[PDB]
Structure formats: structure tokens, C-alpha cells
Write a protein that holds these residues in place. Structure first.
Motif, PDB file in Angstrom:
ATOM      1  N   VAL A   9       0.540  -1.385  -0.059  1.00  0.00           N
ATOM      2  CA  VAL A   9      -0.081  -0.147   0.096  1.00  0.00           C
ATOM      3  C   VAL A   9       0.935   1.241   0.015  1.00  0.00           C
ATOM      4  O   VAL A   9       0.309   2.485  -0.408  1.00  0.00           O
ATOM      5  N   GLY A  10       2.170   1.415   0.522  1.00  0.00           N
ATOM      6  CA  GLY A  10       3.081   2.350   0.113  1.00  0.00           C
ATOM      7  C   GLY A  10       4.259   2.507   0.945  1.00  0.00           C
ATOM      8  O   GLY A  10       4.130   1.566   1.850  1.00  0.00           O
ATOM      9  N   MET A  11       4.993   3.300   0.684  1.00  0.00           N
ATOM     10  CA  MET A  11       6.291   3.693   1.387  1.00  0.00           C
ATOM     11  C   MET A  11       5.856   4.901   2.249  1.00  0.00           C
ATOM     12  O   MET A  11       5.039   5.913   2.088  1.00  0.00           O
ATOM     13  N   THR A  12       6.508   5.136   3.468  1.00  0.00           N
ATOM     14  CA  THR A  12       6.364   6.004   4.625  1.00  0.00           C
ATOM     15  C   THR A  12       7.638   6.207   5.507  1.00  0.00           C
ATOM     16  O   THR A  12       8.642   5.391   5.286  1.00  0.00           O
ATOM     17  N   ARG A  13       7.778   7.093   6.116  1.00  0.00           N
ATOM     18  CA  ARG A  13       8.619   7.576   7.206  1.00  0.00           C
ATOM     19  C   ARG A  13       8.540   7.479   8.626  1.00  0.00           C
ATOM     20  O   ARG A  13       7.467   7.380   8.786  1.00  0.00           O
ATOM     21  N   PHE A  15       9.873   9.219  11.578  1.00  0.00           N
ATOM     22  CA  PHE A  15      10.204  10.276  12.410  1.00  0.00           C
ATOM     23  C   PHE A  15      10.799   9.942  13.394  1.00  0.00           C
ATOM     24  O   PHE A  15      10.464  10.364  14.645  1.00  0.00           O
ATOM     25  N   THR A  16      11.995   9.594  13.594  1.00  0.00           N
ATOM     26  CA  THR A  16      12.979   9.120  14.541  1.00  0.00           C
ATOM     27  C   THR A  16      13.519  10.341  15.068  1.00  0.00           C
ATOM     28  O   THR A  16      14.029  11.253  14.507  1.00  0.00           O
ATOM     29  N   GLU A  17      13.696  10.258  16.494  1.00  0.00           N
ATOM     30  CA  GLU A  17      14.792  11.218  17.347  1.00  0.00           C
ATOM     31  C   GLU A  17      16.283  11.222  16.917  1.00  0.00           C
ATOM     32  O   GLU A  17      16.856  12.217  17.387  1.00  0.00           O
ATOM     33  N   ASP A  18      16.548  10.237  16.086  1.00  0.00           N
ATOM     34  CA  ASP A  18      18.050  10.262  15.368  1.00  0.00           C
ATOM     35  C   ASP A  18      18.242  11.457  14.236  1.00  0.00           C
ATOM     36  O   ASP A  18      19.124  11.523  13.639  1.00  0.00           O
ATOM     37  N   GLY A  19      17.093  12.241  13.789  1.00  0.00           N
ATOM     38  CA  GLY A  19      16.936  13.130  12.941  1.00  0.00           C
ATOM     39  C   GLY A  19      16.987  12.522  11.449  1.00  0.00           C
ATOM     40  O   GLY A  19      16.302  13.227  10.494  1.00  0.00           O
ATOM     41  N   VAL A  20      17.485  11.730  11.294  1.00  0.00           N
ATOM     42  CA  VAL A  20      17.457  10.637   9.895  1.00  0.00           C
ATOM     43  C   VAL A  20      15.870  10.355   9.552  1.00  0.00           C
ATOM     44  O   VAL A  20      15.078  10.111  10.475  1.00  0.00           O
ATOM     45  N   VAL A  26       4.620   0.356   4.840  1.00  0.00           N
ATOM     46  CA  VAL A  26       3.531   0.340   5.775  1.00  0.00           C
ATOM     47  C   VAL A  26       2.605  -1.119   5.691  1.00  0.00           C
ATOM     48  O   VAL A  26       2.502  -1.429   7.147  1.00  0.00           O
ATOM     49  N   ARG A 179       4.611  -1.639  14.013  1.00  0.00           N
ATOM     50  CA  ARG A 179       3.390  -1.033  14.777  1.00  0.00           C
ATOM     51  C   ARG A 179       2.214  -2.084  15.155  1.00  0.00           C
ATOM     52  O   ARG A 179       1.932  -2.181  16.246  1.00  0.00           O
ATOM     53  N   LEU A 186      -2.193  -2.339  10.723  1.00  0.00           N
ATOM     54  CA  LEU A 186      -1.175  -1.610  10.418  1.00  0.00           C
ATOM     55  C   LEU A 186       0.033  -2.543  11.007  1.00  0.00           C
ATOM     56  O   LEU A 186       0.236  -2.577  12.210  1.00  0.00           O
TER      57      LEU A 186
ATOM     58  N   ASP B  73      23.011  14.599  11.550  1.00  0.00           N
ATOM     59  CA  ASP B  73      21.633  15.219  11.565  1.00  0.00           C
ATOM     60  C   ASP B  73      20.536  14.608  10.996  1.00  0.00           C
ATOM     61  O   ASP B  73      19.208  15.028  11.035  1.00  0.00           O
ATOM     62  N   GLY B  74      20.817  14.018   9.636  1.00  0.00           N
ATOM     63  CA  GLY B  74      19.713  13.541   8.856  1.00  0.00           C
ATOM     64  C   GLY B  74      19.148  14.572   7.957  1.00  0.00           C
ATOM     65  O   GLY B  74      18.839  13.946   6.895  1.00  0.00           O
TER      66      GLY B  74
ATOM     67  N   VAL E  79      13.809  16.695  15.837  1.00  0.00           N
ATOM     68  CA  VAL E  79      14.751  17.231  16.381  1.00  0.00           C
ATOM     69  C   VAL E  79      14.911  18.724  16.515  1.00  0.00           C
ATOM     70  O   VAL E  79      15.489  19.333  17.123  1.00  0.00           O
TER      71      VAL E  79
END
Lengths: 209, 122, 56, 120, 114
Positions: A9-13, A15-20, A26, A179, A186, B73-74, E79
RNA sequence: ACACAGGUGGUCAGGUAGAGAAUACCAAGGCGCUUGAGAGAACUCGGGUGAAGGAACUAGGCAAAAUGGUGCCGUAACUUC
RNA sequence: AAUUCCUUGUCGGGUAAGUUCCGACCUGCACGAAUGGCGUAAUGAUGGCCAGGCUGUCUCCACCCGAGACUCAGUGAAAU
RNA sequence: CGAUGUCGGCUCAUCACAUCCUGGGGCUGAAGUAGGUCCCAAGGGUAUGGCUGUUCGCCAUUUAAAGUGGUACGCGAGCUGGGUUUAGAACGUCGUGAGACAGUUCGGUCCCUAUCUGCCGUGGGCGCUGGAGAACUGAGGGGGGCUGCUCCUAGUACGAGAGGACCGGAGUGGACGCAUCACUGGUGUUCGGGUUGUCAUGCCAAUGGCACUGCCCGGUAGCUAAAUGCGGAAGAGAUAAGUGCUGAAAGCAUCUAAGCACGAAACUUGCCCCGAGAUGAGUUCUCCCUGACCCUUUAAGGGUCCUGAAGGAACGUUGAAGACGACGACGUUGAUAGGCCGGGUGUGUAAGCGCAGCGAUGCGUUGAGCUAACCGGUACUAAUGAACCGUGAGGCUUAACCU
């Protein structure tokens, strides 16, 4: 303990605290209908038919429908079966969800990899392009040699040549679940799975730790 | 990229400002250098007021590039041009007594101690 | 040689065995005209599904 | 194969594809049914359907709209004044296609394209 | 699959401004260095901003002479601590790319006052 | 050889732009290249735009690319001035 | 060196390395003063080299466009 | 010699092991750390830059390592064409001279509409025994089998001291593959805006045609690396070199004879894919077909009456299917695709209108006008109700149970 069928159904991101950005696939899993548990019906072992869903009543075939006709006269959209060894099961009208993975780690997925038509060479075998100057004798996108002079008198079996990509599955083994949500259908997995948005995906626990 | 024949700015004092890259260091079959990586560099004009001579080849660390960085930092961070720090031919670490413009801290090897400790970069 | 020996007349026929003349099956009969046609095209007499779409 | 990028190419350049279907759409307003090739019948729609939708809502003035095209005195008078009140009640679906075999063999596939409202 | 169209909205931040190119917004980030949690501000002008909702792009350039820095921030990034809003700019281009090669007196812009 | 992107002395000189018979748009006047229709594969001829570097390419910076107008200022070594 | 085999000689200038180049040395298998001997203004769609500029030549190609290709209906060759 | 095109280079192969690097073992004139050396081993890894037409070579910088080689010293109906080896001319030089020179300098021809096998991709026909659909099993094949740094072990063993280790788990790069467009760049002749010249609408406005998408700036969808993520695991089986136990030939000794266990990065597997034309066509499940008459040397034919399933294709709407086929969703018992409507991204405040200015032009009514792929609504438009193939329980023997 068995496996499940769903759709990419798709690609998604993530949102990690590693900034990447980090990709996550999905994988939307409608609860699999588990329409039959088998008792020594072929080759002296036990198995279960997981059943991905159903088909539209106006577009049904008789030899397909008879495999699900006790649960409904509407086929199953996926006649997938798994081995039964980690439990004892009986057939009921309760579909199995992604809760099957709530204490599980590390999984493998069979996809429907890149349909590219023709695919060519530069996007099939990562080929390079030849010298585009000093005058080029219709030899810009050409392989160089494909063999060697007269002694073999043939191209070798398993040579890299132009040829299509599509009508393929591919199985990927470096995956784990995020998830596992039996209320959102999901699954969500770490990284990018083979195929486009409409690709049908089969998931089970991986033997590589 | 930071690759062969690339002309660069030197982040080092008293000498000349222009220096040229000839190749990437560490690992096999190496093309392109990223920020925190090592290159072999030529002294293109030197000046008699520096500690190195014209046409000598030294080791340098990539500290800034026009495409910059995107893995730590990504998100992408980009500079105005390209610069490197110039290492002592025997003792290593920077040859001069001043370093110009912002500098990397992403490299972890203790052979770069006195440039990976710089408080002005964090 | 440009060809070493001329091909056998069998090889000619084996290509033709994959070259089936499209001749179309199951002709539809119109609901008002005396014509038969292909299921999704107009009759030669200007009718389709017995509706008079064009003059003749 | 380029199948994710949706749209029929159909011959030459976007300047000729403008000019020819603009000329043929002028001829469509004259006859209300046209016979041409099955691909041309599908792409003719893209000139005709916007000029019918331009007349879908009744609003005064602004007859300057689209007034650089279809300006021939034999058909310009039907814009808004017939292209509105013949289709503005139906809510879309202005035209239907019907195949008619081939041309003179000369095996080009032919079709008739008509408006869903035709007058004589 | 509507789950994608849910997840791209239910993660939106609720103390973020709406701003334009030529503005200065004083963005702050945590740096993510050491166990003593940092805070760092990045000063400069907005050269690209919005719209993709949650996914919206946001890039800032220092435009300092003779050399400066350009950084991507993204308005919902994990961040980013804050966007503070400092100065406006009077520029009409949605991408400020004619300015992205300037640092001298050719890089001075009107601060959107009347 | 053929109804073939060829050869080919002479006559004539509209309007806008331009110095111009360049070139760009048009008159008067003429023509629609006498095999075509779909498809939208690489690859291929010919075009358009291109990240971060740069001759690192090639026996040869080959091929491509930059420059370029048209008014004024300014202009080295060498020189038989 | 438009001339010298061993020889990719030597040094200065030079390049990351130069059987390149320029200058110097004479350390030119028989260069040598009317076919001259050597410089040299002007001319060069000019060989050997350098710098400065500029780039799809390259790193390495990515996308976009037409016309072929593909497929179809008709006309319909040659080497062999 | 009635021609079989070259050296090197680009580009791509295949094999040997005399091993360049990797793993195992025994010595060293080997304390520790190491290097060199020899005995087993070829799955995995094996330079870049310069001078040269150039292999080789030499020089520069490095790497885990810069292997030694075969194949017509592989690879020109694959590419190159500097040196070679001609068409022209030039320097040196022999000879009275034409001329000549594995002596020198510039200028400079690479043609071809591929046969049968093959190799990469892709279909059709037959057969599997009455006809189809889908799994399972796995006879069988393909994919794949490197490496720096850093941590811990531990500043321990070892060593005045300098210096400093096993085992192999973890992090982080390199090379090489694999997959992906959610990211981030670029593109974007199916979007919008700015604009030079001219042509049209009588003129102006306004809008459009032409001139490289006329020029110019952004850009959705789509795609793709210059962007993104991820690998070649644990365990089992079996080995050669080799380490040993127990022990004899040889009352001792000994690792080999009997007996037995260990031992490599290789091998057999495991894993991932495909795999029953695996004719050796299995096994299973699901679906379809329940008709006879007459004649006889017949695991066969002759005559005659009635009769058209399952599934696939056709048929046409078409997709995240595509060279053509093939795949797949949907087909009125209808969200398969447009039209109409709406939302999303992109563009950027227009024309009509009013105001400011002599005007170009600006401001405001107007966050305007516009629009495509992104994904919802709405049967308005088209895929109609069919039909032609495909049939009627399917041969013979043996074993069993009923008869």
C-alpha cells in the motif's frame, strides 16, 4: 507459528529522534480468515489455510469457490497455506490479526518486485556507457564483448544480457515489525519491501537472528 | 565531489590559500571523499611564509564541502565552498596554529584528538 | 556463406502455424436491421443494438 | 512502457494536436456526429468537453472566455447559447463513441463520435 | 489506503507558525550530542518553505560574506525544539534562488514594513 | 536509368523588425513534401534541462561548451615604428 | 633539433610522476655559412608544451521531446 | 598468400594453483607483539595516477593485498585505431641516379540489410490418458560464500623496559550485490506565471498563432541516483593437511592396523528463489460432464438419432501489466475508466470593475484567476441480455472385499 498475507500500500517515514528520515513500509493486513485447519489430508502432516479475504460475488469461479464454500460461496483472494506445529487448532469463523506478532521479533517477506517492462541494461545489470566522442560508431549503449573468440563458439549459460523485469516476487529477510496494530490493520516494517503500492505481501518469522 | 583535480581552500595559516586534491585515502578502490574523511593534497602555491613548499603532497581531512552533510543530523547541511585541514607530514594533526571556518566533529578516531575536541564546533 | 543451404519448405509452414488469420467468431445479430455485425461496432446499415444511429 | 504516466500520445506535436482537434471540434459543432479513427475520436473529446463545461453554469457577460478559439461565424454563435441549454441539465457525460470497423483496407480502425443531444 | 492519509495528519505539531521566504524565524534544535541535553539556534534567512503538511520542507541560509551555511530543518522534524519568528522579508519568489548565490549588498532585502 | 533532399545563365524586389537578398512574422501569389494507420519498448538519428567536481578524457582538452551584439573607455611584450 | 645509435643524456626552470616543454652544457654516428648560417616585424580553419577561461569528454550519466524502431494494412529487392 | 584483420587500450569473460590477500597445521638463528618459512587449500577479495602507441618497464600516491599464469599471450559481422604498414610532403644519409632506411617529422581511408547453433527475455501447439483450477511433496537448478578501523578481553598473559595476545561477540567504514521513491537533488514539450519581435481579430485593450518547450522563472504526477535502506546468519553432516587417545605388527615404542574423536574461510546442507515435460508428468484438494439405438473378429470400427459443461480465450472499460503476446481488476446481479463535482500538490492576485499617475505602470474589490497524473463523491458516458470452440462418467490386466 504460521504467517499472514496483506498488501504493501505505500512507502512511509518513521520520524525518529535520530534526525534521519528512515523508510518504513506500511503493509496493510486485513484479518486473515483461517477457513480450514487440516488433519492428515496430504503427506502425513498438519496445516492451515489462512485466506486473505473474499471475491466480488459477480466474478467467481466454481473450482476456486469450492475451497472456501463452507465459510462462504465467495472464494478467498489468496489460497495460502502454512504448517501447524506450534499449536493445536480447529476451524472457526474468527479471522486472525497482526496480534500474532506482539511478542515476535525479526521477520521475512515475499513481495512483487519492480515491474519495469524491458528493463534494458543500465537499469537491469548496472551496465556502463561507452566513450561518446572521437566519433562514435553507433556504439554508445553497447556491452563491449559478450564472450571471446571462436573457442567456446557460444555465449555462456547465465550471461548478463538485456531482458525484462516483472512477473517476479523476491523475498527479503532483513525486516522487523514496528506497529502490529490489530485495530488499524497496520503491521509497519523497518526499510523498503520489493514491488509497487499494489504488491501482495506474505510475512512470517525469520530464521536469521 | 571532493575527488581528483578538485581545487580547494586550505583551513591553515601563514601559507597560501589554494590547494588541489589528487586522491582519496583509507579503504580499497576509493572514489569521492565525505566530511570527516582523509585525502592526499598538493600545495599549489605554498608562499615562503608557510611551513610547506610548492608541489609537495600532504594529508588533509575534509571539513567542509558545497553539498556538505546529511547522515549525522539526517537533514542536509551545505557550505559555500570546499575546505580541508592540513596535517603535519610526520606528527599528524594540523600543521599551522589557526583553523579557519566551521569544522566537523563526526569522525571518532583518536588520531584526530585536537580537532575532534573543539568546543566552538558544538 | 550468406546462407549455407536454402531452408526446407517445412520451416515456411511452421511460421504460418503461428500466423492464424484473424477471421472473428460469434457474429452478433441486430435488433432492427437485417444485418449481422461485431458486438461493439455499428452495422453497415447504420443501426446499433437496433437503434438507428446514422442515415443510409 | 511508461504506464504510471497516464495520457495518449497520438502523433506529431502538441501544436498540431491543438490545431487539428481544434479544427475537427469546429467541424463537430457543425455535424454533431463525426467519423474518424478510434484514437482520434478519444482525443477530440479534450477540445469539445471543456467548451460544453464552459457553458454548464449560467452567468451573465464574460463572453470573452475562450474567444480566441472556435470563432468562425458558422459555429461561434452556438457557444454558450446551444452548448449550455442542450447539456447543462445532464451533469456531464456529453458524448458517446461507437466503432465502425476499418477504413478502405487501408486498415485504420474507425469510429463515430456523437453528442448525447443531437438536433435536425 | 486511508491509513497513510491518517498518519500524515495525526503527527502534525501544534505550536508551529506559518512563514514565507525572506523571513527570519530563529529555529532551535537539540543537537543530540552528549547526555547533557543541548540547545542550538541557527540564524539566517528562509529560502524555501511549505507545503506538504506534516512533510513540509523548510530551508534556511546564512547569506554571510564571503562564506556561510545553508541547512534543511523541516517544520515537523523530531529534532526541532522551536521556531521563534523574528523578522519578515519582502520577496515574491516562492523559491528564493536568485538570492542563493549572493552575500554582499546585493543580498539586502526590505523587511516587509509599511 | 526513376515522378530521386541534387544540377540550374537571365528578369522582378511589397509591409513590420533589421545594416541586410541575414533572420523572425506576414502580403500579392503559391503549396501541403503522392505510401499510410496505430503503438508510445529499449536502442538509434536529431533536439531541451540538469546536482557536486573538472580534462581527472584521448596518442590528440578530439567532440562538445563558454565567449559573442555595438557604442564608448582602455590596452602589453615584441617591432622593420 | 623537422638532424644524435647505445640514451628515457645532464643541470636550471617545471609535474604528484614527466622518453613532453623551455633554457643551459657540447656530452650533435658525416648541422655548417646562396638549397645558404641564424635571428626575425607581419600572416597561420598550424605541430611540441603551459596558464586562464568552459564544459555530458569524464566521474556517471538522470529525466523530458520528436522521428525511426515495434505492431498492422497494402507495394515489394540483392549477396547467397 | 581464389586472405583466417594487428599491438596495446576501452569494455566484458573463462580456467589453472606453482596462493598476492583470506582459514587450518609444524618449525624458526620465533620471549611478548610481529615479520619471513614450510605443510593443507581456489568458494570469497585482487590497484589508481604519470611517461610510453606500448605488453613489459620506470616514476608518483597508497591497500587487507597491489598474485604467478593458460585461452589464436581470450574479447575489431563488439568499440578504438596512436604505433604500426600505402596514398602527399619533410630532416638525416648512401649512390652519378631512379630509389632506400625494425633511422627521424607532420598530414591522413575501420565496409557489411546475422544463416544455424546459442544466450537473455517472452508466447503458442501437444502430452500427463474423460476435461479444467489450485496447492503440497522435492527428483533438480540458480542466488551466495572478502575486508580496514573502533570497543570489549586488558594495559591481563608475556616482557627490566620499549612494546603488548588468544576467544569472537558488538559498533563503524570500504569494496560488491539487492531492493525502494516515504525522504533529498535533478527532470517535468499533459500546470501556472513573466517576456522580445511580429501576425490576427479594422484600431486600442484583451487573448491567441509563429519564431529552439520562441526567450524566461518556478513546478504536480512519473522516473531515477548525485538520493534512500538492507545483506552474504545460527546450527547440523562430512573431510584432506594436522592435533591426540587407546594399542598391535615390533613383549618396548608409536597418531593407524583394528577402534575412536576432533580439524578450514573449501565441500554436503541450512537460508532465499524457481522446480512434476521429475514423460521418472507424483500426492492431495476443489470444479465440470450421468445419452442411447442398430451391425460385426473389436484395448477396433461402421451407420443413425438427440445434445453443448467447468475453465481459459473471445468480447471492451482498463490497471502500480506491457515491444507483441502474456498478467490482472471490472463488465449493468456494474465505482473497470472518463464526463460532471470535490479535495491534494503546483502557480501567484488576472480579465471585466473602480482608484492613483501626463504615462509606462501600480493598488484595491480579489488569498484572485488557473490546472495535469495525487484520491474521494456522482451510473451523466461505455463495457447489454450473448455466442462459436470445449460434451455426454472415460481402455486393459492383477491383488483385495462385496457380487
Amino acid at each position: 507459528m504460521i504467517g499472514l498475507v496483506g498488501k504493501k500500500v505505500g512507502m512511509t517515514r518513521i520520524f525518529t529522534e535520530d534526525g534521519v528520515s528512515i523508510p518504513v513500509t506500511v503493509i496493510e493486513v486485513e484479518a486473515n480468515r483461517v477457513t480450514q485447519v487440516k488433519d492428515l489430508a496430504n503427506d502425513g502432516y498438519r496445516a492451515i489455510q489462512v485466506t486473505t479475504g473474499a471475491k466480488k460475488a459477480n466474478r467467481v469461479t466454481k473450482p476456486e469457490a469450492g475451497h472456501f464454500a463452507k465459510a462462504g460461496v465467495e472464494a478467498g483472494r489468496g489460497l495460502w497455506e502454512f504448517r501447524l506445529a506450534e499449536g493445536e487448532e480447529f476451524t472457526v469463523g474468527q479471522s486472525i490479526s497482526v496480534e500474532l506478532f506482539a511478542d515476535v521479533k525479526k521477520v521475512d517477506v515475499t513481495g512483487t518486485s519492480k515491474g519495469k517492462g524491458f528493463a534494458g541494461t543500465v537499469k537491469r545489470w548496472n551496465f556502463r556507457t561507452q566513450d561518446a566522442t572521437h566519433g562514435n560508431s553507433l556504439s554508445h549503449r553497447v556491452p563491449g564483448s559478450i564472450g571471446q573468440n571462436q573457442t567456446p563458439g557460444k555465449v555462456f549459460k547465465g550471461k548478463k544480457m538485456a531482458g525484462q523485469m516483472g512477473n517476479e516476487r523476491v523475498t527479503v529477510q532483513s525486516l522487523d515489525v514496528v506497529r502490529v496494530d490489530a485495530e488499524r490493520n497496520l503491521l509497519l516494517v523497518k526499510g523498503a519491501v520489493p514491488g509497487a503500492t499494489g504488491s501482495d505481501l506474505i510475512v512470517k518469522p525469520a530464521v536469521k537472528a | 565531489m571532493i575527488q581528483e583535480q578538485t581545487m580547494l581552500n586550505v583551513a591553515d595559516n601563514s601559507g597560501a590559500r589554494r590547494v588541489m586534491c589528487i586522491k582519496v585515502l583509507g579503504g580499497s578502490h576509493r572514489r569521492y571523499a565525505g566530511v570527516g574523511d582523509i585525502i592526499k593534497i598538493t600545495i599549489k602555491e605554498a608562499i615562503p611564509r608557510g611551513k610547506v613548499k610548492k608541489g609537495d603532497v600532504l594529508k588533509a581531512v575534509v571539513v567542509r564541502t558545497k553539498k556538505g552533510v546529511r547522515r549525522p543530523d539526517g537533514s542536509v547541511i551545505r557550505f559555500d565552498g570546499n575546505a580541508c585541514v592540513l596535517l603535519n607530514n610526520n606528527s599528524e594533526q594540523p600543521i599551522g596554529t589557526r583553523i579557519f571556518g566551521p569544522v566537523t566533529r563526526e569522525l571518532r578516531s583518536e588520531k584526530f584528538m585536537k580537532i575532534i575536541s573543539l568546543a566552538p564546533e558544538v | 556463406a550468406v546462407q549455407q543451404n536454402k531452408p526446407t519448405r517445412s520451416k515456411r509452414g511452421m511460421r504460418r502455424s503461428h500466423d492464424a488469420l484473424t477471421a472473428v467468431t460469434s457474429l452478433s445479430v441486430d435488433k432492427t436491421s437485417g444485418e449481422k455485425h461485431l458486438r461493439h461496432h455499428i452495422t453497415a446499415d447504420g443501426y446499433y443494438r437496433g437503434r438507428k444511429v446514422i442515415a443510409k | 512502457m511508461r504506464h504510471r504516466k497516464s495520457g495518449r500520445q497520438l502523433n506529431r506535436n502538441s501544436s498540431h494536436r491543438q490545431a487539428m482537434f481544434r479544427n475537427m471540434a469546429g467541424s463537430l459543432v457543425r455535424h454533431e456526429i463525426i467519423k474518424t479513427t478510434l484514437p482520434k475520436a478519444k482525443e477530440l473529446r479534450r477540445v469539445v468537453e471543456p467548451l460544453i463545461t464552459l457553458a454548464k453554469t449560467d452567468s451573465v457577460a464574460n463572453r470573452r472566455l475562450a474567444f480566441a478559439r472556435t470563432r468562425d461565424n458558422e459555429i461561434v454563435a452556438k457557444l454558450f447559447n446551444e452548448l449550455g441549454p442542450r447539456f447543462a441539465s445532464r451533469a456531464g457525460g456529453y458524448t458517446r463513441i461507437l466503432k465502425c470497423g476499418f477504413r478502405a483496407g487501408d486498415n485504420a480502425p474507425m469510429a463515430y463520435i456523437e453528442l448525447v443531444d443531437r438536433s435536425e | 489506503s486511508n491509513i497513510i492519509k491518517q498518519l500524515e495528519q495525526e503527527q502534525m505539531k501544534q505550536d508551529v507558525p506559518s512563514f514565507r521566504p525572506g523571513d527570519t524565524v530563529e529555529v532551535k534544535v537539540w543537537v543530540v550530542e552528549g547526555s547533557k541535553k543541548r540547545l542550538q539556534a541557527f540564524e539566517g534567512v528562509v529560502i524555501a518553505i511549505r507545503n506538504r503538511g506534516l512533510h513540509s520542507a523548510f530551508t534556511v541560509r546564512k547569506i554571510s560574506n564571503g562564506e556561510g551555511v545553508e541547512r534543511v530543518f523541516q517544520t515537523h522534524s523530531p529534532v526541532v525544539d522551536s521556531i521563534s519568528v523574528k523578522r519578515r522579508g519582502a520577496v515574491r519568489k516562492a523559491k528564493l534562488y536568485y538570492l542563493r548565490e549572493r552575500t554582499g549588498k546585493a543580498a539586502r532585502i526590505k523587511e516587509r514594513l509599511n
